Design a protein around this ligand. Structure first.
Ligand SMILES: Nc1nc2c(ncn2[C@@H]2O[C@H](COP(=O)(O)OP(=O)(O)OP(O)(O)=S)[C@@H](O)[C@H]2O)c(=O)[nH]1
Ligand SMILES: [Mg+2]
Lengths: 145, 181
């Protein structure tokens, strides 16, 4: 019954992440399990749905770290970096903005800006959860190195 | 409660009145502080020809520095509002030079409403006097209509977000275009 701590949770997420999985950033670099443990803090993590082009809501674990937001899926009881619309599942916090989705109070747009921009439409469980996510993402972007 | 939803995207030169037009339509209030747009989206409803439609209003940057961001807004658009300002001949000249080639590329078969904004300035004495110093004058309706023909626009409208003149009609026309296959 040890109380939740963000640093310990990050170690746990990394431990459950598949060693063979990597996730692309927009600049072509990739991110792996080992990078989760390299001088990064966890600001927030929780379940979201990533709305694909086909309109399908894909369950992901979103993990907001010091300099990136990770989108992970499940496979064989382990995390893998999410595969949705061939978009980078590792989002740099530099120059990231967040916006409400005007017709869906549960959702938010994440828009990243060098190698071009990308837009993500993410669904939370409620308007309250949307506000929490947007606030945390904005704060992380503010203090991003 | 509208059972029909359509997507509208607005484009045109920086400062030509896009955000004010969208906010007057969606909130019935003119936003007095000018903040240049990076990306926003709004919701509004309209009843036209006895048909209730919900419009998603995708607001875009008029500034060229955000050219690479704009295509994030274009997918699956039902109607484009392509704007210029009636007090800025330069903004009309950018319609065929910049906005039309971009929209035809990303949205090839999407109907375009060509919209002249800030119609309240056309007969504003101060505006006319200052433009004349620069050998300019406000855009004339005939010039807007000619440009609409030159770019294959679905329609041509003028409005003033500031006075509300023509605003409802811009969006009635846009909704009719949005409803076509
Ligand atoms: N006189 C007059 N001024 C207007 C009207 N609509 C907007 N403006 C003024 O023009 C300025 C720019 O308006 P705005 O709607 O923000 O431009 P924009 O096209 O959205 O600009 P951007 O976001 O691409 S940089 C503001 O000072 C605004 O108050 C109008 O109908 N009449
Ligand atoms: Mg604007």
């Amino acid at each position: 019954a040890i109380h939740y701590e963000k640093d310990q949770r990050l170690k746990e997420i990394a431990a459950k992440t598949d060693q063979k999985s990597s996730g692309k950033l927009k600049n072509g670099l990739t991110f792996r399990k080992e990078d989760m443990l390299q001088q990064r803090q966890l600001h927030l993590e929780g379940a979201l749905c990533w709305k694909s082009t086909s309109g399908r809501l894909k369950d992901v674990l979103a993990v907001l770290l010091t300099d990136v937001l990770l989108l992970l899926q499940e496979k064989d009881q382990k995390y893998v970096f999410a595969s949705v619309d061939s978009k980078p599942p590792v989002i740099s916090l530099q120059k990231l903005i967040v916006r409400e989705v005007a017709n869906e109070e549960k959702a938010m747009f994440l828009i990243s800006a060098m190698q071009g921009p990308e837009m993500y439409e993410m669904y939370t469980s409620s308007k309250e959860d949307r506000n929490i996510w947007m606030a945390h993402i904005r704060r992380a972007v503010e203090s991003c190195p | 409660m509208a059972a029909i939803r359509k997507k509208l995207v607005i484009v045109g030169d920086g400062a030509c009145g896009k955000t004010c037009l969208l906010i007057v339509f969606s909130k019935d209030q003119f936003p007095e502080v000018y903040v240049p747009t990076v990306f926003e989206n709004y919701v509004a409803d309209i009843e036209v020809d006895g048909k209730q439609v919900e419009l998603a209003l995708w607001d875009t940057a008029g500034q060229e520095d955000y050219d690479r961001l704009r295509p994030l807004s274009y997918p699956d658009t039902d109607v484009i509002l392509m704007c210029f300002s009636i007090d800025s001949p330069d903004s009309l000249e950018n319609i065929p030079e910049k906005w039309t080639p971009e929209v035809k590329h990303f949205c090839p078969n999407v109907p375009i409403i060509l919209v002249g904004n800030k119609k309240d300035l056309r007969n504003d004495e101060h505006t006319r006097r200052e433009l004349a110093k620069m050998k300019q004058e406000p855009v004339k309706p005939e010039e807007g209509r000619d440009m609409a023909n030159r770019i294959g626009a679905f329609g041509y409208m003028e409005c003033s977000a500031k006075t509300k003149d023509g605003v409802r009609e811009v969006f009635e026309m846009a909704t009719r275009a949005a409803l076509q296959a």
